[PDB]
């Protein structure tokens, strides 16, 4: 079984996603996404071997007929998904990049001499890296997996196939305390002016933590307003809001449509309603009560009510969120909130392997 991601980090954390070019994985229909993982010789899990983009049904080349059942098998692109590490852990970052580059060279040899065969659990020649196979029901094939023989491809990785996910303490969002926090706060959807705006609205209120409440208000309001903006732009059916009732033609399949996720640029990956836990019950109620008018002064009553209600009931920004991530002291863990960089910015390029 492929280990689940570790959830706790002392400070800011980072994960990388790297789509490979030059090959496909073929697996039975409705297989689990993970088919293996690469770990260090010391035992530390570095990255997962996953299927990503469906490339159509798999057909075993007739010249490679082996008496085996490949019925209803699907081909997919391969994505290498790192286990998260500490952002400032140079050794952990470098080992992940080197292990991905080694695996690409091992795949290059695999499609040359073992085309349309599963990957075997092996140790690298230098002894640094180990492949563990968790689903033996797969095959690796050059190109698009149609021909029996490769075109002598080198397995590569490119910025267009790359993403990074940064995890930070939820209490830090809006403080600009670290370079990672300043990078996240530069997201176009994040409206820092909402912090001082909240301060002006709540002068007569006796808040348990005014600075923390203003940070949470600005974070949540920015997300709610961006969601309403995107629903209107792409004609998204959010909760009970119908874009067609406001003469908007749908041009996305939902909040999880890749073009909608790209529009965020820095995509929140954690359920927004979780951040309410970092505040006192009293402070949370004061923050929540002030969000509704921010939507209603910019958007229709129906869109404002539907976006507010959706996130209040634990709705996700774009599908299944990473909601169990934590930061700080292992004994008294604090909420971590994660963000996907849809395109890797210059500041995070050093975390990504380069062919
Ligand atoms: N605590 C964490 N801190 C930072 N990044 C994390 C953390 N947990 C997971 N990630 C990262 O999030 C990404 C996971 O997205 P993914 O599971 O591949 O989506 P899906 O399976 O739905 O296609 C990886 O880069 C992983 O390292
Ligand atoms: Mn995936």
UniProtKB/Swiss-Prot annotation:
Domain ACD: 2-355
Phenotype of the disrupted gene, per the record: Deletion leads to a loss of TseL secretion and in turn loss of its ability to mediate prey cell killing.
Localization terms from the record: Secreted; Host cytoplasm, Host cytosol
Annotated residues for binding of Mg(2+) 2: 17, 79
Disulfide bond sites: none
Ligand binding (Mg(2+) 1): 17, 163, 340
Transmembrane intervals: none
Annotated residues for binding of ATP: 13-17, 82, 269
Family (UniProt): Belongs to the VgrG protein family.
Known function: Part of the type VI secretion system (T6SS) specialized secretion system, which delivers several virulence factors in both prokaryotic and eukaryotic cells during infection. Forms the spike at the tip of the elongating tube probably formed by hemolysin co-regulated protein/Hcp. Allows the delivery of the TseL antibacterial toxin to target cells where it exerts its toxicity. Also acts directly as an actin-directed toxin that catalyzes the covalent cross-linking of host cytoplasmic monomeric actin.
Subunit description: Interacts with protein VC1417.
Protein name stated in the entry: Actin cross-linking toxin VgrG1
Provenance organism: Vibrio cholerae serotype O1 (strain ATCC 39315 / El Tor Inaba N16961)
UniProt gene name: vgrG1
Residues of the full protein shown: 727 to 1081 of 1163
């Amino acid at each position: 079984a492929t280990p689940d991601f570790p959830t706790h980090f002392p400070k800011s954390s980072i994960g990388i996603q790297n789509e490979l070019a030059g090959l496909v994985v073929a697996m039975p229909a409705n297989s689990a996404q993970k088919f293996g993982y690469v770990k260090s010789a010391q035992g530390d899990a570095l990255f997962m071997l996953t299927k990503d983009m469906n490339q159509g049904s798999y057909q075993r080349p007739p010249s490679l007929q082996d008496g085996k059942n490949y019925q209803n098998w699907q081909t997919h692109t391969v994505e290498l998904v790192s286990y998260p590490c500490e952002m400032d852990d140079k050794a952990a970052v470098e080992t992940r990049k080197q292990a991905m580059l080694w695996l690409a060279t091992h795949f290059t040899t695999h499609i040359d001499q073992s085309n349309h065969q599963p990957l075997a659990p092996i140790q690298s020649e230098d002894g640094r890296f180990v492949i563990e196979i968790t689903n033996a029901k797969h095959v690796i094939a050059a190109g698009n997996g149609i021909s029996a023989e490769s075109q002598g491809q080198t397995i590569t990785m490119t910025p267009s196939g790359q993403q990074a996910t940064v995890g930070v303490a939820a209490k830090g969002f809006g403080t600009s305390a670290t370079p990672e926090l300043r990078l996240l706060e530069s997201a176009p959807w994040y409206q820092k002016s909402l912090k001082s705006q909240f301060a002006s609205l709540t002068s007569a209120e006796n808040l348990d933590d005014k600075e923390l409440a203003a940070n949470v208000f600005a974070y949540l309001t920015s997300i709610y307003l961006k969601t309403a903006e995107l629903a209107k732009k792409f004609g998204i059916y959010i909760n009970e809001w119908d874009p067609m009732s406001e003469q908007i033609t749908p041009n996305a399949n939902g909040l999880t449509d890749p073009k909608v996720k790209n529009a965020w640029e820095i995509l929140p990956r954690t359920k927004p309603s979780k951040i309410v836990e970092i505040l006192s019950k009293s402070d949370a109620k004061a923050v929540m009560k002030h969000i509704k008018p921010q939507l209603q002064s910019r958007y229709s009553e129906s869109l404002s009510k539907n976006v507010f209600q959706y996130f209040q009931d634990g709705g996700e920004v774009a599908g299944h969120g990473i909601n169990n991530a934590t930061v700080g002291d292992k004994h008294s863990p604090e909420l971590a909130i994660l963000f996907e960089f849809r395109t890797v910015p210059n500041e995070l390029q050093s975390y990504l392997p380069k062919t």
